[PDB]
């Protein structure tokens, strides 16, 4: 519901971890960041092994709880949280200045951060956040 982002990032065909790293860095510097097209973000490697890791995180848990996200929305948001001292005042402030969206809710197109782009014509071993979510059982709402 209206996020006054100083920066809009387009994660389409972009390495999740690299975007997450630059976005955490910016948020700590006081930047309000909106990540867009999360379902199209990308993660390199062998799909079967990547999926096993995310499924294991979903299976983990107990009474204390280990609520791990299944939507690309949350997967990405969590990836960013792991790069922020979210339990410290300044860390939670930065984290709360970041939001991830399925598709692009803004009129502006997002910018592609330098060094985060993946070239499909040069890579075949990678998966899409959206593909991971579907495999995990998420409701493809995007």
């Amino acid at each position: 519901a209206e996020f006054d982002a100083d920066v809009i990032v387009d994660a389409r065909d972009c390495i999740m971890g690299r975007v997450a790293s630059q976005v955490a860095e910016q948020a700590l510097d006081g930047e309000t960041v909106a990540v867009v097209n999360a379902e199209r973000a990308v993660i390199t490697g062998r799909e079967e092994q990547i999926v096993e890791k995310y499924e294991k995180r979903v299976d983990i848990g107990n009474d204390n709880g280990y609520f791990y996200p299944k939507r690309p929305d949350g997967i990405f948001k969590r990836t960013i949280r792991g790069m922020l001292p979210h339990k410290k005042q300044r860390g939670r402030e930065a984290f709360e200045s970041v939001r991830v969206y399925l598709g692009n809710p803004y009129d502006e197109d997002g910018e592609v951060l330098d060094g985060t782009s993946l070239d499909r014509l040069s890579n075949i071993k990678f998966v899409t956040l959206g593909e991971i979510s579907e495999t995990l059982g998420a409701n493809k709402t995007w």
Partner: protein
């Protein structure tokens, strides 16, 4: 490396992105030829498969892309055909094409019919004990043929005694 394939006169090939479409009097076929650093393109009356890399893995796929394309050329012109013969001993096997699938009844005397769905725009013509599978896409035709045969597979008993089933008689 690079390989150039002169496209037949009966044929005309178009292509956008990683998809290549080949059309002829026998129909059309569209495929995706996506591999790291291998560029496929239609340069005039020729299709070009090239790459700056020449390692074993890259050379492997280039040779694979060539055959796929030459096969498409053949399919849209001469077409592809597999021949099959239905054999059975005790129980007469009823083989019919119903809708987009081929149904087999009374196989080994079973009450429940076995069936498989034909792939693509593949055509399955049956004449007595003979079956002919044909079409422009070797992938779909080859699979449909294979599917029919697999459809009468048996793991429970000795095959040397129970040989009923439809078998690929001729391969293109």
């Amino acid at each position: 490396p690079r390989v150039e394939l002169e496209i037949p006169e009966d044929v005309d090939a178009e292509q956008d992105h990683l998809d290549i479409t080949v059309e002829g009097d026998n129909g059309s076929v569209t495929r995706r030829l996506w591999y790291p650093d291998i560029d496929v393109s239609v340069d005039g009356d020729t299709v070009v498969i090239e790459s700056d890399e020449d390692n074993a893995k890259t050379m492997s796929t280039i040779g694979t892309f060539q055959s796929h394309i030459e096969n498409m050329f053949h399919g849209v012109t001469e077409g592809w055909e597999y021949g099959m013969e239905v054999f059975y001993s005790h129980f007469p096997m009823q083989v019919n094409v119903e809708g987009d699938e081929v149904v087999i009844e009374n196989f080994l005397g079973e009450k429940a019919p076995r069936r498989t769905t034909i792939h693509g725009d593949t055509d399955v013509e049956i004449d007595g004990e003979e079956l002919t599978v044909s079409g422009p896409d070797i992938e779909a035709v080859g699979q449909t043929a294979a599917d029919i045969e697999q459809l009468t597979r048996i793991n429970d008993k000795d095959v040397r005694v129970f040989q009923d089933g439809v078998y690929i008689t001729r391969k293109p």
